[PDB]
Amino acid sequence: NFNPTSPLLWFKAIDLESTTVNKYRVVRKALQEIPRDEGLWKLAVSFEADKAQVIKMLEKATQFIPQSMDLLTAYTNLQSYHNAKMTLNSFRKILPQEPEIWIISTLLEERNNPKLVSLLKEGLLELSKNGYKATLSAWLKRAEALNDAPNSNLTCQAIVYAILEWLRESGEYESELNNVDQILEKMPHSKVQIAVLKKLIQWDPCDTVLWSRLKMATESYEELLAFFQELLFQTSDDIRANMREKSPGLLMMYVSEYWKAQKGDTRQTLVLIDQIIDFAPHNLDLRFFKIKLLGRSLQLDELRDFFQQTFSSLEDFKISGTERLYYKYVNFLRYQDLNE
């Protein structure tokens, strides 16, 4: 009566009242008296079993507290349509929402789960519309918890990508990247962190990142492999070149992964062959794994044929590191295994 405006009293009253109906009544009274108390609204939302009433309550809450995030999320959860989502967006677009409110929209979008490329577009749109405050890797921190939920990790990835793009547009920082890396390292064996790394890799050559990716995969105890496959297939046109230039252990890593995956020793062989074909000057490292596979399988004539094939290619490689010396030794060994 005397102090209707103070929330604490209402809370106390609620605590006191054990019966659910009574509690509800109290909450209603509080709402009537005080409009802004988020906690009270949340409590109200919680109490009820039926649907329409709950929805109404949510709506009321939304109306009253203009920028309550949890309430908004709850509201979104309720209506269960793309039309509904659109409506929500429309409602929200009129309200000023600079900091990090589109994330909810993104989440809503991929509730369907097939679509996932439009997420990126949405992310891109995000900051160009709003009068944004200069921040880097704030989203990531917030994404984390959000990501940790189901049907959310995928959404997070798009957002991350968008953020990265924005950063790139702005200019290379040096510190921001480091911060991001640190964040990733903290709360390890998580998918959103991995996604960031993946995004980075696509953009630019990062052996450290690749190692990091591997580590992440190990922690998880396949995604990486899938990513690699995608890279190979969607764009050996431009990837072969870069890879060739690198002359790295990426290929070796891939081979190892394949080996780990399969005891059937045919798929891996095929992959190796593809890699060999793919690389224009052909990488030296690949052949050893192929040889090993052949040995495992035990196919003398086939092995011989393979070696012959390798030989022809070999004539261009002059003064190349571990080139002839390794292969010839292997050949000798093979010969010894059958005929001296």
User: Which residues lie closer than 8 Å to 338 by C-beta, 6 or more apart?
Assistant: 300
Q: What does the DSSP 8-state code read for residue 322?
A: T
Q: What is the dihedral of CA 224, 225, 229, 234, to 10 degrees?
A: -20
The CB-side HSE value for 240 (13 A sphere, CA atoms) comes to 13
Whole-number Å distance between alpha carbons of 194 and 197: 5
Residue 155 CB neighbours (<10 A): 27
User: Which residues lie closer than 8 Å to 43 by C-beta, 6 or more apart?
Assistant: 14, 27
Residue 207 vs residues 42, 179, 229: alpha-carbon distances, Å: 48, 18, 17
Amino acid at 38: E
Whole-number Å distance between alpha carbons of 195 and 106: 16
Give the end-to-end CA distance of the chain in Å, rounded to a whole number: 105
Whole-number Å distance between alpha carbons of 337 and 256: 25
Q: What phi and psi values does residue 320 have, to the nearest 5 degrees?
A: -90, 145
Whole-number Å distance between alpha carbons of 106 and 192: 15
CB 161 within 8 A of CB 199: yes
Q: What is the dihedral of CA 26, 30, 32, 35, to 10 degrees?
A: -150
The CB-side HSE value for 321 (13 A sphere, CA atoms) comes to 4
Angle between helices 324-338 and 300-314 (to 10 degrees): 160
Structure determination method: cryo-EM
